[PDB]
Amino acid sequence: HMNPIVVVHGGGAGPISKDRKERVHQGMVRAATVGYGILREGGSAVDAVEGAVVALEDDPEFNAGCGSVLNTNGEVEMDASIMDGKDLSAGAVSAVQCIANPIKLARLVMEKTPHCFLTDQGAAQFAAAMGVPEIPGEKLVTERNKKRLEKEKHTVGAVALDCKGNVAYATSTGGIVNKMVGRVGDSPCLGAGGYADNDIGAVSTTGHGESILKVNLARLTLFHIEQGKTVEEAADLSLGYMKSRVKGLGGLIVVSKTGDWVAKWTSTSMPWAAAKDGKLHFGIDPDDTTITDLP
Amino acid sequence: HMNPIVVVHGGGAGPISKDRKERVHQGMVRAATVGYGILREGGSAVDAVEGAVVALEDDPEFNAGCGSVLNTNGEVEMDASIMDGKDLSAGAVSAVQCIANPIKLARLVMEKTPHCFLTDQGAAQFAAAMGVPEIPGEKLVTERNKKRLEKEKHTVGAVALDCKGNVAYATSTGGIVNKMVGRVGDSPCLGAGGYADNDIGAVSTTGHGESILKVNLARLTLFHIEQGKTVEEAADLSLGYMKSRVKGLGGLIVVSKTGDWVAKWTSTSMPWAAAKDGKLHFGIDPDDTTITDLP
Ligand SMILES: N[C@@H](CC(=O)O)C(=O)O
Ligand SMILES: N[C@@H](CC(=O)O)C(=O)O
Ligand code: NA
Ligand code: NA
C-alpha cells in the first residue's frame, strides 16, 4: 500500500503582511490536517482533496469561497475543478454565485451528472436541484477584498495520493480582482488549473489565470514528469516556460504516483503545506520551510 | 515563406444519410474556400480560421451558430474558442445565447479584453459592449433541431497555417443535444477543443466533449508531434488514447508548423475539407477523398 500524502496551497501572490502570514499559516495547517485526517481513515484521494479545499473555501484569508476576490462589480463569481486520477473523471463549475462550497458542486457535477463542466446560470440551477443552500451574497464578501477592489478601481488547491495509489487534485478560486463579469480563468479548466492521472501524478495550479490556460500548466508539468523528470525539475520546466513564453508567473503543487511531491513557484510567495508520514510541512517564501509532527 | 493551408471539419458524427452527405459537401467547400481566400490574400491564420467557422456557423446544416443542437429546455447554448500560435493569444466563450456567430465573439475576447474566456451573463454583456447584434434565440433554432430534441428525451472547426508561418485554430459548437442547462464541452477550452502553437502546429477537435476535456485531446496530439511522430501518427495515438482510457470517440484536424496536415477520426464519420497548393481535399467517410482543382 502507498504512503499517503496531501499537498495544499493558498495562492501565488506578492508580499504578504507578517501579521496576516499567521492567519494564512494556520489556514494552510488546518487544510492540510483536514486533508491528512481524511486519508488517515484510509480515505480516497478525491475525498481528501475535496475536504482540504472545503476548509480553505470557508477560511476568509483565502481567495476561494468566503474571502473570494471581487469582480469589477464588487461581486463574487467562483471557479472550481476536481479530478479523479483513476478514470480521469472530472467535475467543474465556472461563474458561480452565492454558494458556500464551489468544489462540492464540482464534485456534484462529476458524480451526479454525465457531464464534467457546468457554468453560471445552469450551475446555479444545478446547485438548487442538488439541495445546495444559497448563502447571502454579502457573507462571501470581506472588507479587505473591498479595499483591494477600490485601489484597483481608481485561489486554493490540493493534490493527494491515497493508500491505494490513486491521485487527485482540487482547485478553487474567486479569480483575479477587478475581473470582468463572467470571466473564467484556469482554475475550473482540466489541464490548466489542475490535472490528475494515476499513470503520472496530480497537480493544482495558481498564478496568472490566462497565462496558466495559454500554457495548459497542470498537464505540461505532467508531460515533463512522464518524460522522466523529477517533480522539482518538471515544475521548474513548466513554470519557466510560462514565464518565458507568455511572461506569466505562477505556482503549483504536485504529487507523483511514486509519492514524490513538491511546491514550486515564480510569484513572490505561495503559502503551501504538505502532510506525509505524520509530519506537517509549511512554506511561504522559497527555501524557507518548517516541519512539525502531526498527531 | 510558407504555402498557406486551411483545414476545416464539420464535426464527428454517426452514419450520415444520402441527402445530408451532399449538403455537407457544399458547406464544407464554402468554408474551406473562404479561409483559403483569406490566406491567398495576405490574411492571417486567425482571420482564415475565423472566416471558415463563421461560414459553418451561419450555415444551418452544422452544429454551431444557426443550426446548433438545443439544450434540455429547447434553447441554443453555444461555446467557441480561437487561438493564435505566435504568442498563444486566445479567446473563448461558453454557453452564449441570442447571437449568430460565437466564434466572432471569441475573437473579440482575445483582442479587446485582458481575458481568454467569458461565459453566459458575462459573455452577453461583453457582446453588447462590442455592438454584437442581439437577435431572438428562436432564429438560431432550426426545425431539424426541434425534432432531434423531442426524440432524444424519448461541431465545426478550422486550423490554418499562413504565409508568415502563423498557425491558428477555431472551434464552435451548439454542444450536444439535450445537454443540461449551462453544460460546457471541450469547444471553448484551450488544449481540449483546440490548441495553436507556431512552434508545433494547430489542432481542432470534435466528438464527445467530456472525453476530450479529460485527455486534453488537442494538446495531446501536439505532444506527439513534439516527440517526432508525424501528424497522422500524432492523431492516431491521441485519438487511440481517448478510446482506451475514457471510452471516447471523435475526431481532429491537425497542421504542423512546416505544412503537413491530416483529418482523422475514430467516430463513424467526420465531414472535413483541406486547401493547399491550389487543390481541395474533401471527405466524410474513411478514405473517400476527392482531390479537385481550386481555380
Ligand atoms: N489562477 C487564478 C488566480 C490565483 O491563482 O490567485 C485565476 O486567474 O483565476
Ligand atoms: N465536442 C462538442 C460536441 C462534438 O464535437 O460532437 C461538445 O461537447 O460540445
Ligand atoms: Na476562503
Ligand atoms: Na451552423
Nearest to A119 by CA among B82, B117, B111: B117
Q: Which residue's C-alpha comes closest to atom 9 of ligand 2?
A: B175
Angle, nearest 10°, between helix axes A231-246 and A217-226?
Answer: 130
Which grid coordinates belong to B33?
Answer: 474556400
Where are the domains positioned within chain B?
Answer: 1-295
Cα B195 to averaged position of ligand 2 atoms, centre (Å): 16
DSSP readout, chain A? ----EEEEE---BS---HHHHHHHHHHHHHHHHHHHHHHHTT--HHHHHHHHHHHHHHSTTSSSSTT----TTS---EEEEEEETTTTEEEEEEEE-SBS-HHHHHHHHHHHSS-SEEEHHHHHHHHHHTTPPBP-TTTS--HHHHHHHHHHT--EEEEEE-TTS-EEEEEEE--STTPPTTB--STTSBTTTEEEETTTEEEEEEE-HHHHHHHTHHHHHHHHHHTT--HHHHHHHHHHHHHHHH---EEEEEEETT--EEEEESSSB--EEEEETTEEEEESSTT-EEEEE--
Cα B64 to averaged position of ligand 4 atoms, centre (Å): 4
* Element containing residue B81 per DSSP (H, E): strand B78-84
Residue B95 to residue A119, Cβ atoms within 8 A: yes
- HSE at residue A270, side-chain half, CA atoms within 13 A, is 29
Contact in structure between A125 and A107 (CB atoms under 8 Å): no
Residue of A nearest to B87 (CA): A246
What is the separation, in whole angstroms, between the first and last Cα of chain A?
21
Cα B275 to averaged position of ligand 4 atoms, centre (Å): 21
Nearest to B119 among A95, A216, A223 (CB): A95
Residue A123 to residue B189, Cβ atoms within 8 A: no
Which experimental technique did the depositors report for determining this structure? X-ray
Q: Are strands B156-161 and A250-256 parallel, antiparallel or unpaired?
A: unpaired
Q: Is A115 on the interface with B (CB under 8 A)?
A: yes
For residue B155, indicate whether it is catalytic: yes
Q: Starting at the edge strand that comes first in sequence, how are the strands of the sheet with A5-9 ordered?
A: A117-119, A89-96, A78-84, A167-173, A156-161, A5-9, A272-276, A279-283, A289-293
Contact in structure between A94 and A123 (CB atoms under 8 Å): yes
In angstroms, the CA B215 to CA A231 distance is 21
Residue B192 to residue A190, Cβ atoms within 8 A: yes
DSSP designation for B46 = H
Where is the binding site for substrate, in residues of B? 183-186, 206-209
Q: From residue B264, give the alpha-carbon distance in Å to each of A95, A151, B20, B144, B272.
A: 34, 51, 20, 27, 9
DSSP designation for B2 = P
Task: Name the catalytic one among B119, B142, B155, B230.
Answer: B155
Instruction: Calculate the CA B65 to chain-centre distance.
Output: 12
Would you tell me which residues 158-187 of chain B have a C-beta closer than 8 angstroms to some C-beta of chain A?
179-185
Q: Is A187 in the pocket of ligand 1 (CB under 6 A)?
A: yes
- HSE at residue A127, side-chain half, CA atoms within 13 A, is 26
Which grid coordinates belong to A151?
Answer: 485601489
Cα A98 to averaged position of ligand 3 atoms, centre (Å): 13
Q: Are strands A89-96 and A117-119 parallel, antiparallel or unpaired?
A: parallel
Give the phi and the psi of residue A9 in degrees, each rounded to 5. -140, 160
Give the phi and the psi of residue A95 in degrees, each rounded to 5. 60, 35
Q: Is A129 on the interface with B (CB under 8 A)?
A: no
Query: In residues, how long is chain A?
Result: 295
Give the phi and the psi of residue B283 in degrees, each rounded to 5. -160, 170
Give the residues across from A84 on adjacent strands: A89, A168
At position A15, the amino acid (one-letter code) is P
Contact in structure between A31 and A8 (CB atoms under 8 Å): yes
Residue corresponding to grid cell 445546495? A132
| Backbone conformation region of residue B227, classed left if phi is above 0, alpha if psi is from -120 to 50, else beta | alpha
Nearest to B182 among A118, A185, A189 (CB): A118
Determine how many CB atoms are found less than 10 A away from the CB of residue A42: 11
Contact in structure between A168 and A90 (CB atoms under 8 Å): no
Instruction: Calculate the CA A273 to chain-centre distance.
Output: 12
Q: Is B125 on the interface with A (CB under 8 A)?
A: yes
3-state secondary structure B90-154: EEEEEEECCCCCHHHHHHHHHHHCCCCCEEHHHHHHHHHHCCCCCCCHHHHCCHHHHHHHHHHCC
Residue B251 three-state SS? strand
In angstroms, the CA B242 to CA B217 distance is 7
What is the separation, in whole angstroms, between the first and last Cα of chain B?
22
Query: In residues, how long is chain B?
Result: 295
Q: Ligand 1, residues A53, A76, A145, A186: which to mutate, most atoms within 8 A of Cβ?
A: A186
Q: Starting at the edge strand that comes first in sequence, how are the strands of the sheet with B250-256 ordered?
A: B194-197, B201-207, B250-256, B261-265
Residues of A in contact with B238 (CB under 8 A): none
Where does chain A break, by residue before each gap (C–N > 2.5 Å)? 154
Q: From residue B80, give the alpha-carbon distance in Å to each of A37, B20, B155, B158.
A: 42, 24, 10, 12
Which grid coordinates belong to B224?
Answer: 506527439
Q: Starting at the edge strand that comes first in sequence, how are the strands of the sheet with B78-84 ordered?
A: B118-119, B90-96, B78-84, B167-173, B156-161, B5-9, B272-276, B279-283, B290-293
Query: Which ligand gives the minimal distance to the CA of A62?
Result: 3
Q: Is A44 in the pocket of ligand 1 (CB under 6 A)?
A: no
Cα B155 to averaged position of ligand 1 atoms, centre (Å): 30
Nearest to A181 among B88, B122, B192 (CB): B122
**Closest ligand 1 atom number to CA of residue A209:** 8
In angstroms, the CA A182 to CA A151 distance is 21
Q: Is B126 on the interface with A (CB under 8 A)?
A: yes
Task: Determine the distance in angstroms separating the CA of B246 from the nearest CA of chain A, rounded to an integer.
Answer: 7
Q: Is A97 on the interface with B (CB under 8 A)?
A: no
